[PDB]
């Protein structure tokens, strides 16, 4: 991807067939892991949707084949169908399965690795993974941050978790980092909610708190958020940030670059 150009994945997706999407949505509802799942019906619905070109159904069904409830080749075939439709997620899935470097051998990538192709089409998982490699392995912080923010901007929670970790561990901008942890947690990110559950705990060491002062109310709040989310990954917390603004940081205020 040179030069790096950030695009929105939505501008590179096939339209979804209405009947197909009805079938997909019904299968998704039936397949919720915290319910007693009717596997035959779920596979049937996904399969009907796949026959009418639904790429999200291809993705979910391929996952089911990868784990069983196992058919490696059926999963691979589905990923290839997605790639055939130039679905960005398809390139990501193929990378995540057989490896990134094999992408150069696939004609649909045009001599790009699978992740590079996916990221070129705006895929937030690929953007997040490559951004991570640029920051921590290549030492190209600014470029990796551009990748990561391109994914975060599309509402991708794990990318907000990566930004939080960067600003906490590398930049040491704790209010910024906390803003990103809270954003990821609100969007359902388990890692982020877990970290936030320790930040205002008086029994946490200073570094776990990012040197915030302990706060009983906020500890109970974020401990509760994490409790809920840990049991049910589908929860979101759309009001969390605005209903409970962050206290000022004892030395960094509301931005380490502008302590005042
Ligand atoms: Au496209
Ligand atoms: Au998935
Ligand atoms: Au540092
Ligand atoms: Au507490
Ligand atoms: Au609240
Ligand atoms: Au509050």
d(CA 94, CA 24): 21
DSSP for residue 62 = H
Query: Length of the chain in residues, anyone?
Result: 260
Output the six-digit token pair for 142: 């600014």
Look at residue 202 and give its three-state secondary structure: coil
Phi first, then psi, for residue 219 (nearest 5°) are: -60, -45
Q: Which listed ligand is nearest to 61 at the C-alpha?
A: 2
CB proximity list for 129: less than 8 A, separation 6 or greater: 115
Determination technique used: X-ray
d(CA 23, CA 42): 9
d(CA 161, CA 15): 30
Q: Which listed ligand is nearest to 202 at the C-alpha?
A: 4
Q: Which listed ligand is nearest to 63 at the C-alpha?
A: 2
d(CA 46, CA 35): 18
- What is the whole-number distance in angstroms between the Cα of residue 257 and the centre of ligand 4? 30
Chain centroid offset of residue 149 CA: 12
- What is the whole-number distance in angstroms between the Cα of residue 169 and the centre of ligand 3? 6
Q: What share of the chain is helix, strand, coil (3-state, %, to 5)?
A: 65, 0, 35
Using a 10 angstrom Cβ sphere, with 0-12 exposed, 13-18 middle and 19 or more buried, the burial of residue 5 is: exposed
Q: Which listed ligand is nearest to 11 at the C-alpha?
A: 1
- What is the whole-number distance in angstroms between the Cα of residue 209 and the centre of ligand 1? 43
- What is the whole-number distance in angstroms between the Cα of residue 99 and the centre of ligand 6? 45
- What is the whole-number distance in angstroms between the Cα of residue 172 and the centre of ligand 3? 6
d(CA 199, CA 218): 9
Phi first, then psi, for residue 45 (nearest 5°) are: -65, -45
d(CA 172, CA 164): 10
CB proximity list for 245: less than 8 A, separation 6 or greater: none
- What is the whole-number distance in angstroms between the Cα of residue 222 and the centre of ligand 6? 10
Look at residue 18 and give its three-state secondary structure: helix
- What's the Cα-to-Cα distance from 36 to each of 18, 30, 39, 62, rounded to whole Å? 27, 8, 9, 21
Cis omega (within 30 of 0) for bond into 174: no
- What residues sit around ligand 4, an ion, with C-beta below 5 angstroms? 219-220
Nearest Cα to 169, choosing from 116, 200, 220, 132?
Answer: 132
- What is the whole-number distance in angstroms between the Cα of residue 242 and the centre of ligand 5? 9
Q: What's the angle, vertex CA 14, arms to CA 123 and CA 68, rounded to 5?
A: 70
- What's the Cα-to-Cα distance from 51 to each of 88, 208, 238, rounded to whole Å? 19, 50, 36
DSSP H or E segment with residue 72: helix 72-84
CB proximity list for 19: less than 8 A, separation 6 or greater: 52
- What is the whole-number distance in angstroms between the Cα of residue 69 and the centre of ligand 6? 42
Look at residue 149 and give its three-state secondary structure: helix
- What's the Cα-to-Cα distance from 144 to each of 100, 136, 159, rounded to whole Å? 18, 9, 11
d(CA 252, CA 139): 26
Buried b (16+ CB within 10 A) or exposed e, 222-237: beebbeebeeeeeeeb
Buried b (16+ CB within 10 A) or exposed e, 91-116: bbbbbbeeebeebeebebbeebbbbb
- What is the whole-number distance in angstroms between the Cα of residue 90 and the centre of ligand 2? 11
d(CA 16, CA 243): 36
């Amino acid at each position: 991807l040179r030069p790096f150009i950030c695009v929105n994945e939505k501008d590179h997706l096939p339209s979804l067939d209405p009947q197909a999407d009805a079938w997909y949505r019904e299968a998704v509802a039936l397949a919720k892991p915290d319910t007693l799942r009717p596997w035959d019906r779920i596979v049937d619905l996904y399969s009907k949707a796949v026959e009418r070109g639904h790429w999200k159904a291809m993705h979910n069904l391929a996952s089911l084949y990868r784990t069983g409830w196992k058919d490696t080749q059926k999963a691979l075939d589905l990923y290839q169908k997605m790639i055939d439709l130039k679905v960005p997620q398809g390139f990501y899935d193929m990378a995540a399965m057989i490896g990134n470097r094999a992408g150069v051998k696939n004609p649909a990538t045009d001599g790009l690795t699978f992740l590079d192709k996916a990221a070129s089409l705006g895929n937030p998982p690929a953007l997040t993974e490559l951004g991570r490699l640029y920051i921590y392995v290549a030492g190209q912080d600014e470029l990796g941050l551009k990748y990561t923010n391109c994914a975060a901007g599309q509402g991708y929670a794990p990318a907000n978790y990566e930004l939080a970790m960067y600003y906490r561990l590398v930049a040491h901008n704790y209010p910024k980092a906390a803003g990103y942890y809270l954003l990821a947690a609100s969007q359902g990110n388990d890692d982020a909610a877990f970290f936030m559950s320790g930040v205002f705990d008086k029994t946490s060491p200073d570094v776990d708190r990012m040197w915030y002062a302990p706060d009983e109310k906020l500890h109970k709040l974020y401990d509760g958020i994490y409790d809920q989310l840990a049991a049910d990954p589908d929860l979101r917390f759309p009001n969390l940030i605005k209903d409970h603004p962050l206290p000022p940081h004892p030395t960094q205020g509301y931005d380490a670059d502008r302590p005042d």
